[PDB]
Design an enzyme around this catalytic site. Structure first.
Site, PDB file in Angstrom:
ATOM      1  N   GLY A  37      -7.095   5.526   1.436  1.00  0.00           N
ATOM      2  CA  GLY A  37      -5.967   5.889   2.257  1.00  0.00           C
ATOM      3  C   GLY A  37      -6.327   6.871   3.384  1.00  0.00           C
ATOM      4  N   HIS A  63     -10.307  -6.077   4.552  1.00  0.00           N
ATOM      5  CA  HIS A  63     -10.437  -4.756   3.915  1.00  0.00           C
ATOM      6  C   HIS A  63      -9.357  -4.561   2.911  1.00  0.00           C
ATOM      7  CE1 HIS A  63     -11.208  -0.411   3.764  1.00  0.00           C
ATOM      8  NE2 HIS A  63      -9.896  -0.268   3.702  1.00  0.00           N
ATOM      9  N   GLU A  68     -14.002  -6.674   7.150  1.00  0.00           N
ATOM     10  CA  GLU A  68     -13.542  -5.258   7.070  1.00  0.00           C
ATOM     11  C   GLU A  68     -12.633  -4.842   8.250  1.00  0.00           C
ATOM     12  OE1 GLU A  68     -13.794  -3.231   4.800  1.00  0.00           O
ATOM     13  OE2 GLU A  68     -15.310  -3.856   3.356  1.00  0.00           O
ATOM     14  N   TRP A  93       0.776  -1.278   0.000  1.00  0.00           N
ATOM     15  CA  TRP A  93       0.000   0.000   0.000  1.00  0.00           C
ATOM     16  C   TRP A  93       0.798   1.315   0.000  1.00  0.00           C
ATOM     17  CZ3 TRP A  93      -4.662  -1.452  -1.365  1.00  0.00           C
ATOM     18  CH2 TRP A  93      -5.077  -2.750  -1.004  1.00  0.00           C
ATOM     19  N   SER A 147     -12.634   2.421   0.062  1.00  0.00           N
ATOM     20  CA  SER A 147     -12.411   3.113   1.353  1.00  0.00           C
ATOM     21  C   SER A 147     -12.614   4.664   1.194  1.00  0.00           C
ATOM     22  CB  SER A 147     -10.999   2.818   1.843  1.00  0.00           C
ATOM     23  OG  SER A 147     -10.920   2.750   3.242  1.00  0.00           O
TER      24      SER A 147
END
Ligand SMILES: *[C@@H]1O[C@H](CO[C@@H]2O[C@@H](C)[C@@H](O)[C@@H](O)[C@@H]2O)[C@@H](O[C@@H]2O[C@H](CO)[C@@H](O)[C@H](O)[C@H]2NC(C)=O)[C@H](O)[C@H]1NC(C)=O
Ligand SMILES: *[C@@H]1O[C@H](CO[C@@H]2O[C@@H](C)[C@@H](O)[C@@H](O)[C@@H]2O)[C@@H](O[C@@H]2O[C@H](CO)[C@@H](O)[C@H](O)[C@H]2NC(C)=O)[C@H](O)[C@H]1NC(C)=O
Ligand SMILES: *[C@@H]1O[C@H](CO[C@H]2O[C@@H](C)[C@@H](O)[C@@H](O)[C@@H]2O)[C@@H](O[C@@H]2O[C@H](CO)[C@@H](O)[C@H](O)[C@H]2NC(C)=O)[C@H](O)[C@H]1NC(C)=O
Ligand SMILES: *[C@@H]1O[C@H](CO[C@H]2O[C@@H](C)[C@@H](O)[C@@H](O)[C@@H]2O)[C@@H](O[C@@H]2O[C@H](CO)[C@@H](O)[C@H](O)[C@H]2NC(C)=O)[C@H](O)[C@H]1NC(C)=O
Ligand SMILES: *[C@@H]1O[C@H](CO[C@H]2O[C@@H](C)[C@@H](O)[C@@H](O)[C@@H]2O)[C@@H](O[C@@H]2O[C@H](CO)[C@@H](O)[C@H](O)[C@H]2NC(C)=O)[C@H](O)[C@H]1NC(C)=O
Ligand SMILES: *[C@@H]1O[C@H](CO[C@H]2O[C@@H](C)[C@@H](O)[C@@H](O)[C@@H]2O)[C@@H](O[C@@H]2O[C@H](CO)[C@@H](O)[C@H](O)[C@H]2NC(C)=O)[C@H](O)[C@H]1NC(C)=O
Ligand SMILES: *[C@@H]1O[C@H](CO)[C@@H](O)[C@H](O)[C@H]1NC(C)=O
Ligand SMILES: *[C@@H]1O[C@H](CO)[C@@H](O)[C@H](O)[C@H]1NC(C)=O
Ligand SMILES: *[C@@H]1O[C@H](CO)[C@@H](O)[C@H](O)[C@H]1NC(C)=O
Ligand SMILES: *[C@@H]1O[C@H](CO)[C@@H](O)[C@H](O)[C@H]1NC(C)=O
Ligand SMILES: *[C@@H]1O[C@H](CO)[C@@H](O)[C@H](O)[C@H]1NC(C)=O
Ligand SMILES: *[C@@H]1O[C@H](CO)[C@@H](O)[C@H](O)[C@H]1NC(C)=O
Ligand SMILES: [Br-]
Ligand SMILES: [Br-]
Ligand SMILES: [Ca+2]
Ligand SMILES: [Cl-]
Ligand SMILES: [Cl-]
Ligand SMILES: [Cl-]
Ligand SMILES: [Cl-]
Ligand SMILES: [Cl-]
Ligand SMILES: [Cl-]
Ligand SMILES: [Cl-]
Ligand SMILES: [Cl-]
Ligand SMILES: [Cl-]
Ligand SMILES: [Cl-]
Ligand code: NA
Ligand code: NA
Ligand code: NA
Ligand code: NA
EC number: 3.1.1.8
Lengths: 527, 176, 352
Positions: free
Chosen positions: A114, A436, A323, A80, A196
């Site tokens: 993010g 998630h 999640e 990420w 998200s």
């Protein structure tokens, strides 16, 4: 040699080999003036124009941001993190087009998540080339400002009005309206999709009247603006702007002057202080997010949603079966990616303290009461499972269900999924379940790459999801019509049908987390 | 298939083969083991019960349908045989209510609930468990075809059990 | 037509396309093509629709065939624009002679070079556009002939001939299926055999002759038209369906071929209105009525004959599935044409 003429000048792309065919990629096309110097904290200004050929042959700078340093060297978290230099000069987007060039292709625009503090369009899991190859859609993604540089707010002050990164997203949509026909795309068939904070962003474009004309439909993956983390209240934004000032030695009396002082700080100084503008964060903290600015957002979005003030069109909404788990290894006591994280009652209670900072005693007990009624056994994983459910139901699943229901009450078709497949390659441990963020690589068709060590059942599932997303963008109906698949029923507020996405049996199910969401949605907001 | 469908034309057997050996995908080595158990159970039990339930309810009466999906922790038959024929009976009759007997806690709970449901159906014609915030058992009607799943984990309402499979057995198969 | 027909006294805002067989499939593809939306008002589809098994060449097939054609004309190349330049020096006779062989086995229904998904006229597979309601919203008139399949049986099916009654055996029926369903598993052919050779009873010697005509006509024409009509009407528009069941008194083909494919066209176009021409009186009446019906559908979107106490033509909806029969004897309203047969072709057959 592939050159396209845009309103602002010529850009050159690159050819890609994908599954025995070719995708054209334009990576890093600028879409606004670099927001530097006097332009830091302002709305994105339009781009000047160039003669000569601009080389869009590599991903561009990611926007300034703090990096996740909890698991260095670990793929689960590092996948990420930004994979291009950080710079304030980050206002760029990427285009992927089928070859041969399409005539009037549907466009899919990705908005990354993010927490509004991190993210970049250049991650491996956001690579649009598979969608372009396989479904002949055009995929577009953009970098938008995050963190304070993106969302610092002094309302009504155009030196720092708030929502800047939402206006970045909007100006990339306008770039699409103006330019995408030149690439063979249909500016009248655009679907936004995002996950998200990117999903919350999509839902705020549904509310913003300046975005109404810039897209056709919307997909919201694990996020919606009514999630508790998604909108900074006016009170909070002011506290935080002032707190940031105090920390950077920029406390002033004249507000335009706080802002001039913050514009001489350099990005590292602003970034280091962002974490402390709140006196207690959680793994869900959004220190600088969307506000009610009177511009992008004219009123509190809960009110716009309730009273039907939003773009009327179809939506696809969904969530992942687990999640909450990802968040538990960033601070909850007794949790670790490196063991089975069996926790006690007391650990669960300190856990709630970590996730619900303040939060009365009674508010925490009532959560404890609603989620620790055991059938029975006593299963040692009870409390480990419960706290993941608490965090995921409160932050993602119940807000998405409520959004979906409030939106459909105004007449439009909505479709809801429950994603329940755990990647065979997940680097996080088994107890974290269907995490998630881990549907994204299925949506983007990474398992369609055989060379890549996903299972056959997973190629099939991604193939089907990709078809479903594509048909939703082109036709507003996320069916897979050819391979005797389960028909996806619309979500209505009575029956509340949704579809499960897995490799085993795809089902139609009703009223997801009914008992749990009644707690979060009706009781919890009063504490 | 030859053992279970003695005579049974070639074509009748291939058509069964065709309906149950369309793999998604993989190839999972248990595919054919699982398929033949499904063939035998769908043909002999599940599709006839569903058709009975549906034909009977069409005349106006309340009907309730369950899908039992719990494998006894004490089953002496091996794991691949799954939730076998005959192995709900000891739950209906409340054997797991005997603690001295080596069933799990989750299994005492499940049998307690089934026993209450069967009892309420006999005394009142409605197989609800009304006291312990349980899932309400909807009547089976021929349109929506709701049934209830009985397990130790999540009790659900589901619709149109084995729809694809029973269409094969119920409409196509009797003509061969 | 859009640009010029007002000069001839026509209304460019009132245009109905009509066509038969491949022309009907063509009409149905204009319903799907966004470049055609503005160029017409309504549509009539006679014995054809793009979801018929012969009507669209898949991308795989088209490539094989283009390359096969190249190979046969001595035009096999590496650069594709260059195959095409080579084919442009061949002269038409050379291209025509080779077309028949670009497939390794044809049938009387073969369409070696048909519509493809080109990304231009057709942006996606048309089955998907149809299912998901992406097509021009307007009224349609669709129909078929009672014996669609027979015409095809005398171009290759064993034991069939225009010059005798073509009574065939079980074995001939089986080789027949082999001729029409080239490959087609054993099981796929038996299942057809099974669905169409369940006799009530007798045994009537024409059983198998009749069955293979039904197999070919239900699979290629009748079931695809019914499915099109039903999928299209589900999006809200009026649709009308006919079953044409009159055999021309002048048909030059023999009696066992019945009400053939193609033999409603001369009624639609009003040839029996010419007295000098040796059709019956009942046939002048029938054509007069069909012509009025087609005309009223084009001008008004409703194919009624309103003046002569005729049977009212009900719209086709997906529940009741009403259609009208066109014959010289009794015009009727009927429901759910070939229900049993089309369930076979439409739900079961595409999986084999
Ligand atoms: C609104 O902000 C104040 C100030 O926060 C402190 O100073 C910042 C610059 C930063 O470094 C923060 O972490 C500091 O907490 C908050 O006031 C503080 O609240 C905490 C906890 O309640 C308290 O123990 C401190 O003594 C307070 N400090 C001061 C200077 O008053 C206040 O809580 C914020 N409002 C919220 C969360 O609603
Ligand atoms: C795709 O095309 C090939 C090639 O077809 C052959 O060559 C052509 C130019 C033409 O003259 C055809 O009639 C030929 O059949 C097909 O491959 C052949 O398949 C047949 C029957 O299966 C086989 O017996 C031949 O040996 C093959 N010939 C070669 C050169 O490979 C193939 O079947 C076509 N694909 C289809 C129908 O899907
Ligand atoms: C590309 O197609 C568009 C419209 O296509 C879309 O229709 C939208 C309403 C939406 O449903 C979307 O998902 C779907 O694909 C064409 O627009 C048409 O042409 C011009 C262009 O502005 C307009 O003047 C027409 O009125 C308009 N028709 C419609 C129905 O909106 C567009 O021309 C086309 N471009 C090509 C082929 O180059
Ligand atoms: C699972 O691990 C956790 C997480 O913290 C630990 O990471 C481990 C893999 C291990 O190397 C350890 O050194 C590291 O702290 C354990 O929680 C910790 O429990 C210990 C018990 O000695 C306490 O001292 C700590 O307060 C607590 N630390 C933190 C930071 O939360 C956990 O006990 C273990 N659970 C198992 C094995 O089920
Ligand atoms: C010929 O008549 C047309 C329209 O007639 C048609 O209405 C269509 C919608 C369709 O139902 C068709 O079957 C029916 O016959 C006239 O069009 C009108 O006039 C002009 C021409 O472009 C337009 O500006 C008007 O708005 C329009 N009216 C309508 C209702 O569309 C057309 O003028 C006429 N031409 C002649 C008499 O010369
Ligand atoms: C009906 O005729 C068919 C068709 O083939 C024939 O055309 C006839 C009118 C006749 O002149 C004949 O010469 C010509 O072949 C007959 O099928 C044929 O059956 C014969 C039996 O001797 C076989 O030898 C052939 O294989 C077969 N030929 C073909 C090309 O299919 C058919 O038997 C006959 N049916 C009747 C009278 O009911
Ligand atoms: C862009 O790249 C091309 C070829 O890859 C090169 O010819 C051109 O000069 C480049 N322009 C730059 C670096 O400004
Ligand atoms: C605050 O200061 C700036 C000086 O740059 C000025 O533009 C602004 O008008 C001032 N306003 C007030 C109310 O102090
Ligand atoms: C459907 O299955 C076919 C095989 O018949 C396969 O080629 C294709 O990729 C599948 N398509 C989708 C959208 O799942
Ligand atoms: C319901 O739960 C209670 C505990 O409150 C227990 O004593 C009882 O056996 C349960 N009854 C049924 C029918 O499940
Ligand atoms: C193929 O050849 C023709 C030469 O006439 C040329 O126009 C085309 O660009 C060539 N392309 C490739 C990829 O070989
Ligand atoms: C209706 O019948 C009349 C006789 O009354 C005849 O002149 C006419 O051609 C018929 N019209 C149609 C459309 O059938
Ligand atoms: Br607010
Ligand atoms: Br195709
Ligand atoms: Ca057989
Ligand atoms: Cl669950
Ligand atoms: Cl306690
Ligand atoms: Cl909520
Ligand atoms: Cl509650
Ligand atoms: Cl049965
Ligand atoms: Cl079947
Ligand atoms: Cl008939
Ligand atoms: Cl036989
Ligand atoms: Cl069909
Ligand atoms: Cl059937
Ligand atoms: Na306020
Ligand atoms: Na995180
Ligand atoms: Na394809
Ligand atoms: Na012919």
């Amino acid at each position: 040699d592939i050159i396209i003429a845009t309103k602002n000048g010529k850009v050159r792309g690159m050819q890609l080999t994908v599954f025995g065919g070719t995708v054209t990629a334009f990576l890093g096309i600028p879409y606004a003036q670099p927001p530097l110097g006097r332009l830091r904290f302002k709305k994105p200004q339009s781009l000047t124009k160039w003669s000569d050929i601009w080389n869009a042959t590599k991903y561009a700078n990611s926007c300034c941001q703090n990096i996740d340093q909890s698991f260095p060297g670990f793929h689960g978290s590092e996948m990420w993190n930004p994979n291009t230099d950080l710079s304030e000069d980050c206002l760029y987007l990427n285009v992927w087009i089928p070859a041969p060039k399409p005539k009037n292709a549907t466009v899919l625009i990705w908005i990354y998540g993010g927490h509004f503090q991190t993210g970049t369009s250049s991650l491996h899991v956001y690579d649009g080339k598979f969608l372009a190859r396989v479904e002949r859609v055009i995929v577009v993604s953009m970098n938008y400002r995050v963190g304070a540089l993106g969302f610092l707010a002094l309302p009504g002050n155009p030196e720092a009005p708030g929502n800047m990164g939402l206006f970045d997203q909007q100006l990339a949509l306008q770039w699409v309206q103006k330019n995408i026909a030149a690439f063979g795309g249909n500016p009248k068939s655009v679907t936004l999709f995002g996950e998200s904070a990117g999903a919350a962003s999509v839902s705020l474009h549904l509310l913003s009247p300046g975005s109404h004309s810039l897209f056709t439909r919307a997909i919201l993956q694990s996020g919606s603006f009514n999630a508790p983390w998604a909108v900074t209240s006016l009170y909070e934004a002011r506290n935080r702007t002032l707190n940031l000032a105090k920390l950077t030695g920029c406390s002033r009396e004249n507000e335009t002057e706080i802002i001039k002082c913050l514009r001489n700080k350099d990005p590292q100084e602003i970034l280091l202080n962002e974490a402390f503008v709140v006196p207690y964060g959680t793994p869900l903290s959004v220190n600088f997010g969307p506000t009610v600015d009177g511009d992008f957002l004219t009123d509190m979005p809960d009110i716009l949603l309730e009273l039907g003030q939003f773009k009327k069109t179809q939506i696809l909404v969904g969530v992942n079966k687990d999640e909450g788990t990802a968040f538990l290894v960033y601070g909850a006591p007794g949790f670790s990616k490196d063991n089975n994280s069996i926790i006690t009652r007391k650990e669960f209670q300190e856990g709630l303290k970590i996730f619900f900072p303040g939060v009365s005693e009674f508010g925490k007990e009532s959560i404890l009461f609603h989620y620790t009624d055991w059938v029975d056994d006593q299963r040692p994983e009870n409390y480990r499972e419960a706290l993941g459910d608490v965090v995921g139901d409160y932050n993602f699943i119940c807000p998405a269900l409520e959004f979906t229901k409030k939106f459909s009450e105004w007449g439009n078709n909505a479709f809801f999924y429950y994603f329940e497949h755990r990647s065979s390659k997940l680097p996080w441990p088994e107890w974290m379940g269907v995490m998630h963020g881990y549907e994204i690589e299925f949506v983007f068709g990474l398992p369609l790459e055989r060379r890549d060590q996903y299972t056959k059942a997973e190629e099939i599932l991604s193939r089907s999801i990709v078809k479903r997303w594509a048909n939703f963008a082109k036709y507003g109906n996320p069916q897979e019509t050819q391979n005797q698949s389960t028909s996806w029923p619309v979500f209505k507020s009575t029956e509340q049908k949704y579809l499960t996405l897995n490799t085993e049996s795809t089902r139609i199910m009703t009223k997801l987390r009914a008992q749990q969401c009644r707690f979060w949605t009706s009781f919890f907001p009063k504490v």
